Amino acid sequence: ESKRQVSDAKKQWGNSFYKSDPRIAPLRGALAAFNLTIDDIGVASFHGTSTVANDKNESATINNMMKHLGRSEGNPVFGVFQKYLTGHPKGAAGAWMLNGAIQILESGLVPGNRNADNVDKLLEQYEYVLYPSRSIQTDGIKAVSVTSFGFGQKGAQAVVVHPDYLFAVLDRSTYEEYATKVSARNKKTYRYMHNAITRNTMFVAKDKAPYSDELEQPVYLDPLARVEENKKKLVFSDKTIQSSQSYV
């Protein structure tokens, strides 16, 4: 109960301090949780669906939200328009847009719309956004915005911050313990991928549940029931359910 109190205090003062303040925008506060400003969104992944209405409305709304949030004048977001390359996969769109947004984060590279033959003169009035037609390798991108507009009046925005700002809220010992685990998992995944890409066994269809038909409901009713390994298989066992050693 004290661990909950510490977690709730950190929530109140670090993560969602902006939930109750009308003077802090959701986008301002979301970045400010990581001590980042609106100037730190480097890339805007535009829904960019090669339509007359969407590519004007989306640029206008990104310009307006960057103009209201007090972006430094002369600091446009680099607009990436992935749909020129992949097309528009209505449901999958925002996923490909988001996945690329993560790839843009780690590399720092901003892809360019290589079909940007001629950007609208109607898009020059949006100074808070830039429209690359050529990949530019930057020195580091703090955050990326991904906006997707669907049919039936459903706009959506995700904002993706670099993992470096999560690893800075935690102490040295935690980071160095996490790093060794990630390195070990990286070799395990390396082995798995090299085996699977050569033997066509990447998707291992599972016929059995971790719980047995007789331990299915006891696992459901224990918030602490967890899987153990045996014979290279992770399964639920009789001795791990409602255990007296699992709440110490």
Binding site: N118, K121, L123, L130, Y131, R134, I136, D139
Partner: protein, 145 residues
């Protein structure tokens, strides 16, 4: 060959200098900090002239944000980026409200044919020792021969 191929709906019109200027400024800016462009180079002057040919009041605001907040402490290439960017800003400000200009600062090259010892002919367009810029080009073109 006499087959008519013109169609008014295949015309490709290119106007958006305002976007390409801002793209090229920041392309050169990261070329500087990653060690790909120094100020002594001659193509750097060419593309800085092409940036000041496209200078708009919003383009100097674009340049100044990235020059003011260019972090000097990250390395010496960031010092070079800030100095060169500030000089280009100062040039674009006074070129601002003036007339875009075709100034070719290419390094003048002449022909040299040489036969290698193995017997190969190579024609190299070599940089001229006596004529390095079109100012000297015009002077020696007026010189006759």
């Amino acid at each position: 060959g006499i087959q008519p191929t013109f169609s008014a709906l295949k015309s490709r019109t290119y106007d958006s200098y305002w976007n390409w200027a801002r793209q090229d400024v920041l392309s050169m800016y990261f070329d500087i900090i990653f060690g790909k462009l120094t100020s002594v180079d001659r193509e750097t002057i060419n593309q800085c002239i092409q940036i000041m040919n496209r200078a708009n009041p919003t383009l100097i605001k674009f340049m100044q944000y990235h020059i003011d907040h260019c972090p000097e402490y990250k390395g010496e290439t960031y010092k070079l980026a800030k100095r060169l960017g500030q000089q280009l800003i100062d040039n674009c400000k006074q070129v601002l409200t003036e007339d875009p200009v075709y100034k070719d600062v290419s390094r003048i090259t002449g022909p040299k044919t040489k036969v290698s010892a193995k017997g190969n002919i190579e024609y190299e367009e070599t940089q001229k020792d006596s004529v390095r810029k079109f100012e000297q080009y015009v002077y020696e073109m007026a010189q006759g021969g």
